[PDB]
Design a protein around this ligand. Structure first.
Ligand SMILES: [Fe+3]
Ligand SMILES: [Fe+3]
Lengths: 225, 225
């Protein structure tokens, strides 16, 4: 497996490039529109071919590049059934997405948004804004739900093996990766917290409205158009 | 081996945490003073003990945390013989630094600075500002020399195995890692460039002086004191 983590300073978004060493097929997870040239340049120079693009959820902080990438490489766009309608492959819990020899298992992890999903790839999982490094995404927009996010964290993600690496969709403090074992112990909002305790925290976070939410959400519904 | 890459947005500096699974000894490479609490919290939560702190070179963009870390954990500060005098272990080309059962081989890679070195750990090398992702550090300050840097890249670093991962001290475009094979083929300043060609490029880069060099350099020669 060929693995590359990409960072977009503007939105603090993590883009993930996973390549299959057999078929040389590559997939970009949560790519950013402004970073299209960077991403494609990395794919080519690593001697891979972009055949898939995954979106963990409809983003409100950046414009997805899935649409722009599909125009350039004819890659398959994958998303939640509750996500962008123009996505070629719409997946739900239990589904699998084949990227060459790579088999991604789809995990439904709503809470941040109702269309939020996670991609399990063996020893690692890409969780988007559901599970972050020592935190989690907000639940006050995009039909978010604190109670639902608690289920996605404790029952869906935390049941994964301890050594499983967690690659989040964002980080604002310079952390690049965490693990399930780490979060089951040191997550300030979930570890030692009940559902009601977790709900009370999220409902009273008092955070400013997402900067690009009124622009990004409609655009990302159309795969960034 | 426990590996964690940390990013400091203010200086675009990459800090590297390498932990030994056997002895639980950990080392921080190029730690940032403003990120001391973050770094130590990561070391503890990963069940490790900071015993060593490496610095690739005297930095001109941020204050090193080696001194402050030495105050808290009594960690061994390692640096070049031309680096900070208050460093406990001063190394040169050919030397080895052992962090538990981890064996770091020291590679002398001047050019950016006269005290710039690289740490080889098996399948990966930490190059500081000598070799960057699709680039290299500037050679017009703190005893920098384009001729030396060309030699450090082509004769010292590029002779390492192709599959060797390269973890740079900085990146300003969101790239986290490259490899020797990639840079031998796609480095815009060295690939297909002679020594004289490379020198003339660096001689006329026309860059603004690092707006911290007058504060950071003398401070980092005192290990961030
Ligand atoms: Fe989000
Ligand atoms: Fe430097």
């Amino acid at each position: 497996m060929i693995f590359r983590q990409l960072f977009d300073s503007e939105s603090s978004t993590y883009t993930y490039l996973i390549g299959d060493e057999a078929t040389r097929q590559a997939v970009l997870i949560d790519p950013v529109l402004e970073q299209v040239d960077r991403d494609l340049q990395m794919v080519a120079e690593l001697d891979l071919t972009l055949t898939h693009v995954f979106d963990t959820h409809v983003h409100a902080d950046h414009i997805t590049a899935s649409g722009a990438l599909r125009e350039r490489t004819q890659a398959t766009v994958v998303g939640s059934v509750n996500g962008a309608s123009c996505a070629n492959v719409q997946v739900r819990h239990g589904d699998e997405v084949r990227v060459g020899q790579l088999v991604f298992q789809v995990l439904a992890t709503p809470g941040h948004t109702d269309d939020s999903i996670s991609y399990l790839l063996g020893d690692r999982v890409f969780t988007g804004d559901a599970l972050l490094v020592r935190g989690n995404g907000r639940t006050d927009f995009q039909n978010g739900n604190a109670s639902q996010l608690y289920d996605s964290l404790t029952r869906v993600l935390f049941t994964l093996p301890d050594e499983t690496l967690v690659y989040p969709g964002h980080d604002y403090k310079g952390r690049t990766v965490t693990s399930i074992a780490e979060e089951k112990r040191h997550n300030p909002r979930v570890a030692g917290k009940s559902r009601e305790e977790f709900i009370h925290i999220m409902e009273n976070l008092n955070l400013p409205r997402p900067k690009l939410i009124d622009a990004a959400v409609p655009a990302n519904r159309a795969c960034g158009h």
